[PDB]
Amino acid sequence: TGELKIECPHTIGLGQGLVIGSVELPPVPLTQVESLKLESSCNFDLHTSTSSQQPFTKWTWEMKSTSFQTKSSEINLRGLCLVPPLVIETAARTRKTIACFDLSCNQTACQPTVFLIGPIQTCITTKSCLLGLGDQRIQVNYEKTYCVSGQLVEGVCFNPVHTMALSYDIVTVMVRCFLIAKKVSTGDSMKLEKSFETLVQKTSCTGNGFQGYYICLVGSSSEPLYIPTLDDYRSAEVLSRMAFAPHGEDAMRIIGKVTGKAPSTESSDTIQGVAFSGNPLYTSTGVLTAKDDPVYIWAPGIIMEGNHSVCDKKTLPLTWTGFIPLPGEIE
Amino acid sequence: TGELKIECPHTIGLGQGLVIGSVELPPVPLTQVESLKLESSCNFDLHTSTSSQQPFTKWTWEMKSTSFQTKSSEINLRGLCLVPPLVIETAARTRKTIACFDLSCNQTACQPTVFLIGPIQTCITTKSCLLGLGDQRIQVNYEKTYCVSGQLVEGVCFNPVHTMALSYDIVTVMVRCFLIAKKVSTGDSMKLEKSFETLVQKTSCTGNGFQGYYICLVGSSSEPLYIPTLDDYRSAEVLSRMAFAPHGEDAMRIIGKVTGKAPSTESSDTIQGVAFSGNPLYTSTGVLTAKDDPVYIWAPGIIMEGNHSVCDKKTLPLTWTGFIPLPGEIE
Amino acid sequence: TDTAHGSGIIPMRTDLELDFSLPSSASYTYRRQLQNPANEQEKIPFHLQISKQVIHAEIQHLGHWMDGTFNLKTAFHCYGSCEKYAYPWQTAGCFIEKDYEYESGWGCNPPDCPGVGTGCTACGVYLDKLKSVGKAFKIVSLRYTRKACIQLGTEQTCKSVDSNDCLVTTSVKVCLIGTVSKFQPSDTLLFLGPLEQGGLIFKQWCTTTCQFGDPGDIMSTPVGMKCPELNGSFRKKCAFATTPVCQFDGNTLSGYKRMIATKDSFQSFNVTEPHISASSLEWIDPDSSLRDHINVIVGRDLSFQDLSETPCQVDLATTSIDGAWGSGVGFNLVCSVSLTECSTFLTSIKACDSAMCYGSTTANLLRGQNTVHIVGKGGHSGSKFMCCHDTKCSSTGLVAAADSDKIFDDGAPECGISCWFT
Amino acid sequence: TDTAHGSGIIPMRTDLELDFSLPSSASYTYRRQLQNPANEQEKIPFHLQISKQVIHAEIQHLGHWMDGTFNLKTAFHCYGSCEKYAYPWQTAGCFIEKDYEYESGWGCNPPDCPGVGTGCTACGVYLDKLKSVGKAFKIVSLRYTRKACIQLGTEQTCKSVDSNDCLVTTSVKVCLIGTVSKFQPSDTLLFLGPLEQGGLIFKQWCTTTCQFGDPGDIMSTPVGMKCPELNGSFRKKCAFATTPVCQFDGNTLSGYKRMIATKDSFQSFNVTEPHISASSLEWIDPDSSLRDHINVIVGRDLSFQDLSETPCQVDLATTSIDGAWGSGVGFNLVCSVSLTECSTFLTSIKACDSAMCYGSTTANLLRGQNTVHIVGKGGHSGSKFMCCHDTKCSSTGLVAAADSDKIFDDGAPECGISCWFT
Ligand SMILES: *[C@@H]1O[C@H](CO)[C@@H](O[C@@H]2O[C@H](CO)[C@@H](O[C@@H]3O[C@H](CO)[C@@H](O)[C@H](O[C@H]4O[C@H](CO)[C@@H](O)[C@H](O)[C@@H]4O)[C@@H]3O)[C@H](O)[C@H]2NC(C)=O)[C@H](O)[C@H]1NC(C)=O
Ligand SMILES: *[C@@H]1O[C@H](CO)[C@@H](O[C@@H]2O[C@H](CO)[C@@H](O[C@@H]3O[C@H](CO)[C@@H](O)[C@H](O[C@H]4O[C@H](CO)[C@@H](O)[C@H](O)[C@@H]4O)[C@@H]3O)[C@H](O)[C@H]2NC(C)=O)[C@H](O)[C@H]1NC(C)=O
Ligand SMILES: *[C@@H]1O[C@H](CO)[C@@H](O[C@@H]2O[C@H](CO)[C@@H](O)[C@H](O)[C@H]2NC(C)=O)[C@H](O)[C@H]1NC(C)=O
Ligand SMILES: *[C@@H]1O[C@H](CO)[C@@H](O[C@@H]2O[C@H](CO)[C@@H](O)[C@H](O)[C@H]2NC(C)=O)[C@H](O)[C@H]1NC(C)=O
Ligand SMILES: *[C@@H]1O[C@H](CO)[C@@H](O)[C@H](O)[C@H]1NC(C)=O
Ligand SMILES: *[C@@H]1O[C@H](CO)[C@@H](O)[C@H](O)[C@H]1NC(C)=O
């Protein structure tokens, strides 16, 4: 039994906050990954979006005798954290709970990371409940916070700044973000990879057309944070940490550079990365930055290219976990 | 009996020094001035130069009803301080004593000032002796100095700097100077009034041709100081004090401006000054600056023009008494 | 109705010299009555009021202290060189990489790559979860100032006495000469939270050669990040027919973690009323760990005639009481002090009874009515507390039923054993 | 052959704090032996040497003070105006003229000029015989410094302690906090002769409104002459049928003359080892009219183990004597001190006998032989004077037949009445 801890605040407050928790489970063989279904015994209202079938290009490597053979094909996965637009943003109002997983994989095995997001009211209704994923049971524990006004962060009770203007103590908090595909008809407002390129590039990249955004939750509970929100200091912070740690923040053995075709029907290579063996470390899921219409990739045993300074064959991860410093008061 | 005090040093030293003293006597009527002869009972070797006949233009004023009538004539005086070139400068070597007087006069009376200059050896030979001038007796008193290395100046024993280079205490000492007529054939090296004009003038004066210099003694005893000696700090000091106090340094009633002819045979006026009455204050003798060949003037009751900033009709005094600061050591 | 609760009378046969050692968070109140040695009935008041110590420290902003987590990864390649490919640790905030270029033998080789001297084994140590934990400042210079006020007869003079300055008047001179300080230059003050919570003092704050674990290893300077090196060495652990993993036998805990572990081994300090700017840091030390040496001298040429014409008249009356006479509860007395024939007059009022005086309060009175509060502790059941000046007291008093960082020295003779347990 | 002439042994159970009030022209020598409270036989030497006071005064060159002679002249004219002609006083160095323009009546008129309201009577007051009598400087700021050297065990440290600085080591701290000074800013120091002869102190040195007779009336500034006005008024004294003379009923004596007259009413001061520049004036005050407050503190964490390995060995031997044992004559002793196992060691040698020690001499010994002179006064007929360190003394001594501005404090117990008149 794994443990997914939810830190519950003393009050609901302004209504629009969500609780979030997550746990990384033990390795399962690859052949079992396509069968994985999240089950819930919990007394909450599961959003059905994530358990539908979702098309991915599977990209894999084998030793050959540069010394690699890669290949790819299109498959359907279910239960992954591909959250539709507005679902997280309006979950406090709809009273919907999002439960989904990401995959961190080597060639032969995957560690699912289960994410649970939902309304703060769940803390009134629920002390503990169970999720299942394949053969693993997950104990969700809702636990009331030691603090009076904030959250337990690095063993310290902390409340961040709230005002919209400019004016403190500084505490480093966890941020968890989910990639959302969202197109507009006209212009470049949703061209997410262009935002990264302005932050970390010298010269002009021609074709990074992916349209979407990240939706993030800060700490154990917060209102959703949209990335990018141009004049928000927290958005700026998350983007900068993403730009320097594109596979998130926290033995794996690097083998070499690999390329491949995504989707597999492409005549030439559209993706690159670094093949590895040993313990999976980063998530193995992302989207090509080059296509407006998302091309989703699952690349077990390969760290797909996420360096924003590169122009071609790069990706954005489906989920991203890191840390940002927040100004506020320790109490 | 008047008193002429000579301050005697402890040693003769380097051989070339002279002692000097002077006393101003009571007023005598003008008619008696032409008869005045210096007599001496002293055991020293009188230089005979000053007791010869010496031609002066006498310039006098009377009230009239601008309100003045002036007149002039040529007369011979004797005993005045008209010292020939080299006499003072070589007196230490020749062992000659100079005794002469200057005159400070109003319209009706004159106060002779008797000057006695001579070799320091006189201090060995002589404690006191007598000079006579008309009906006045003068007691010369040679008195040995309170000091060990210097001279009693303002009630303080002082020794001035001796080195020819640049390096102290500062003491103000008396300087007494005698005008000497001395011509050269060629150039402007002896044009004394030109030296004054460079020091105190804006623009160019045309005709100040007097040729001569001052010979001065510092304190009660010194070597002769030639004015001007261009690179000597003491010469510079004496000249500057002369330029600001042209009748010397130390009730008289001013009546107005007067002019006259010197010599009396001139068709137009060659001299100006200020008529006064009351107690004679300054000396009444000088030379025209305009003539190479000296025109000597005796002007009782008139302060003859000595302002060096003026171009025309000006004079240099025959004797000049003032004070200069000397650097040295008080002991 | 007056009572013998006067101040110390000092005859001015000789000069009056005094030396003081004021604590850091202490305010002194020295007052006497200087007596003319030619007339017993000619006395003038002398008051000396010295404030607390104001510490002014020109500092250097070191920046923010960052806390991270240790992580190690290994990257293996069969052909090529180590300086040919990229690694995920090279793009982190702080990273140190040691690679075994061209050192591919056969005992450390995996089941693949049957080659010798052609592979590459890179090892990367990086730090993640970088979050600020405190602010650090470095002392460049120190300055101590105190505000002093004197009151002699009818004259009143105040000044802020520095170390290179003295309050000098025609008859009184107050100088500040020495200062024993807990702080000294080249010290590092670290504030974990806000200013008022205090901080810690570090002497060996690393500046040039910083290592992971030292105080000041990871710093967030305004120019950018300043990452340290590691305290340890790398090694390649490998088995037969396995990919060579990379080990690091060195320090894993960060500088902040070790500081929290041995926090008790560092010097602590508190601050009160802080004022920080881009160049200075002013605060008052409440721990009373600093001493200032003050020299006061009053000449005996006081000219008692000039300081006697039109003195400062002071009348007072007790108007309110609140508290208890028990030793520990305390009481508060309200006095209505009326100052006349003087614009401003610096003195002090005491809450006295028939025998003793259980409190005092120094105030600079203005011409007119003045409300003065006096705190007191002690007294008996029948103690009728009254307001009192030097000698004159109020007409009536009040009775009750059932430290402050001030020092009072008026030279009054305290009651003996007759006032103990009565 | 040693004798019980040791220094004061101080057990280090608590910290050792000291306050000093050094005179101006005084050098202190405080030395003890700090004892380990865990071992009676573990003692380390502690020496404290403080030099004289060095006064640094940033000054303003006021220039030279001039002395002159008062003179008054009168000038009369029958027609015209007073602003038409020139006068011999207008060209002097300092002159003040008051003229009665157009005020020609008839009672003040001479036998000539039968006119009314047409003449001119000018009066000129001028000064002659201008000679410099002294140099004047104005104090802008003051600074006091002292050079201090400490010697603890085997460590030696020296520094020039200022008012804003302290000699701080790992175990000793010496601070200079306060300074009672005879001089203060805005004072005027006047040197009549050279520097070494001293000078006088003037407070009311005239700057803006100078009058004839005030200190600083006639000044020879580097820019030029600065002449004052006069303290008095003019008047016209005249008789019938006589030229009107001019009178001045005011001050005639100059400022230097009055200063010489009442010189005893001014503050005097001396200087030693003077150094004057275009901006400062450094000297040591020999009158001992200044006091410096020094705070010394030695912590009890001395680590007696580290300061005990390889101490400084000192051997000595008396080699010469010269003088008498009479109380007033004095004697001079020569010691050959040999320092080993230390490069430099600061200590002091004393000239002792069987009972007392009549002199001392502090010296910073070098590794090898050192010749040390010791002056002493006192002793008896059979007094065999020897050189002595803390405890060890020379093998033999010498006998004789038939203040210094130093202060010695070694804590040695002096002999009682048994050494008086024996
Ligand atoms: C992808 O990642 C997975 C998970 O990280 C990884 O598979 C795992 O590998 C480990 C070690 O390689 C396996 O561990 C074994 O566990 C059994 C359980 O009883 C043990 O008995 C085994 O012990 C023997 O082997 C060791 C060899 O060094 C000896 O030290 C020991 O004394 C024993 O002889 C053994 O350690 C584990 O079972 C798998 N996990 C799964 C989920 O299959 C995999 O290697 C990674 N894939 C790649 C291609 O890198
Ligand atoms: C040129 O200068 C000379 C000298 O300075 C000067 O001649 C002198 O004038 C004074 C006063 O004018 C004369 O003084 C007289 O002396 C006799 C001697 O016994 C006295 O008795 C006189 O006293 C009477 O006069 C006074 C008039 O005010 C009264 O106050 C007094 O009580 C007496 O009545 C008188 O003072 C002196 O004699 C002459 N000296 C000489 C040498 O002749 C002369 O005036 C100046 N000339 C000019 C044109 O200005
Ligand atoms: C991210 O991508 C850029 C571009 O490929 C890499 O930048 C190059 O890095 C090497 C070595 O650090 C330099 O010599 C080149 O000059 C860089 N080129 C440019 C255009 O910047 C960067 O290193 C990559 N980051 C990784 C792999 O972490
Ligand atoms: C010396 O002579 C000069 C020139 O005659 C005088 O200078 C003039 O003085 C008046 C009043 O002081 C000024 O208004 C003029 O501007 C000056 N002229 C020049 C050319 O300098 C000077 O005053 C005389 N000195 C005296 C009489 O003492
Ligand atoms: C700071 O204040 C707290 C308050 O309880 C006290 O315990 C602590 O000793 C103070 N700090 C110092 C250095 O005295
Ligand atoms: C200066 O030294 C002399 C030396 O005799 C002394 O008399 C005088 O008192 C000293 N000055 C002061 C101000 O003490």
Numbering used by the authors:
A (entry chain G), B (entry chain B): 27 to 91, 102 to 203, 209 to 291, 301 to 381
C (entry chain D), D (entry chain A): 668 to 1069, 1082 to 1101
Show the paper's wording.
Entry of a hantavirus into a host cell is negotiated by two membrane-anchored glycoproteins, Gn and Gc, which form a lattice decorating the lipid bilayer envelope of the mature virion. The Gc adopts a three-domain (domains I−III) class II fusion protein architecture and is postulated to associate closely with the Gn, linking adjacent Gn tetramers. Endosomal escape is mediated by the Gc in a process that involves engagement of the target membrane by the Gc-encoded fusion loop, followed by upward ‘zippering action’ conformational rearrangements of the transmembrane-anchored Gc domain III, which bring together host and viral membranes. Here we structurally characterize the epitope of mAb P-4G2, a potently neutralizing antibody derived following experimental infection of bank voles with Puumala virus (PUUV), a hantavirus responsible for one of the most frequently occurring hantaviral diseases, a mild form of HFRS known as nephropathia epidemica (NE).
To ascertain the position of the P-4G2 epitope in the context of the hantaviral envelope, we generated PUUV virus-like particles (VLPs) by transient expression of the PUUV genomic M-segment in mammalian cells. Consistent with previous studies of hantavirus ultrastructure and Gc oligomerization, breakpoints exist in the (Gn−Gc)4 lattices. While the overall assembly of (Gn−Gc)4 spikes remain similar to that obtained from fitting into the cryo-ET reconstruction of an individual, Fab-treated glycoprotein spike fitting into the latticed reconstruction provides a structural basis for the formation of PUUV Gc homo-dimers at contact points between neighboring spikes, which closely resemble a crystallographically observed homo-dimer interface reported previously for HTNV Gc. Furthermore, modeling of Fab P-4G2 binding onto the Gc homodimer demonstrates that neighboring epitopes are not mutually accessible for Fab binding in their lattice-integrated form, providing clues to how Fab P-4G2 recognition may be accompanied by dissociation of the Gc homodimer assembly.
